[PDB]
Design a protein around this ligand. Structure first.
Ligand SMILES: [Cu+2]
Ligand SMILES: [Cu+2]
Ligand SMILES: [Cu+2]
Ligand SMILES: [Cu+2]
Ligand SMILES: [Cu+2]
Ligand SMILES: [Cu+2]
Ligand SMILES: [Cu+2]
Ligand SMILES: [Cu+2]
Ligand SMILES: [Cu+2]
Ligand SMILES: [Cu+2]
Lengths: 5, 462
């Protein structure tokens, strides 16, 4: 689900 | 809404003009290289003897041709060197490279400038030097790397870095994974750019603001995996990159506990999901894989880029718990007679400087008496947009008192030799030198060091 920046 | 890291989001490397994104390599997955422990030439309880040889070779990094590389007692990086507190240590330094080099023990409280192995300690091709010393400092992860001035960046790029493990009695008594290569591993974080025939070319990739390539390399491995055979694993993160910052987290935000920083155990364990490391910073963490099962592969990322896969095998349950206190940090009292030292890092690119000046090898910039603790106020004067400058001091382990008058970051309450200073920020350090001589302080973006953003301090007996 989660992605970074 | 919020960044998951402690540093100032606008200052991250990824905002820089010439930023080089990491890209996933198509190279096949392979086992993480774990450097062997360097066998002593001889050891007794009181004395240990090592030979450390800088050498050139070839390493199979990508399919096809082998990459020409340099290492310590191996073709790339180096065998891990174990030192013990209070043990008289003897090292023969041998250079078999075509270039002169230097053997810098980053974080080791040894005398400078010769044993320290900075600018003033050249070892020419074909020659040998003999050093000895006794470490009187807490257990931690240090490292060895080349430090000729200039040319540190290029030599590190060729592959001259190695992990150094310092043992003591206190750390040995803690319930920590300590089976090297099995449940306790180096994670040396680097990046490179491969050119034709899988070769490196520092000069083609040069940038005065910091060299970074798009291919991540972990312990000299491309697309590494690690076979986990225990519930808990200790990772010794070292940022051995020329410039790049690592923003480390697992794919699913698996928590991990930091137990160690640059210079010592942390006073207390600190729980993390996301951890940012600037150049030369070390962080020792325990990961608990107890919620996973045989066949699972759990991947450690920086930003959105996968770095290191953990293949879960069968493991016995581990019921142990960390104590609430790991380590007693005994802060020195500042010498009241001594002023506050102000150090200003200025400029970017070619214009980087400290206190208005570029490095000069003959010149002493500062003095401080040994045995006496002093406040160092260190300012990153870089306007917005700026960058996080990792400030390093040779020959001391310092303590972090405050950041812009506020608390240090949660993982900055132990001893450290390198600290990331945000744009505009003043940090206050407590700095004591135990030994007399000449020591360097500088930014540890290695292109900044080479570009002259360094100064030297003379320590003397009063
Ligand atoms: Cu942004
Ligand atoms: Cu001795
Ligand atoms: Cu000796
Ligand atoms: Cu260093
Ligand atoms: Cu250093
Ligand atoms: Cu995350
Ligand atoms: Cu298995
Ligand atoms: Cu910059
Ligand atoms: Cu240095
Ligand atoms: Cu810098």
């Amino acid at each position: 689900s989660h992605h970074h920046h």
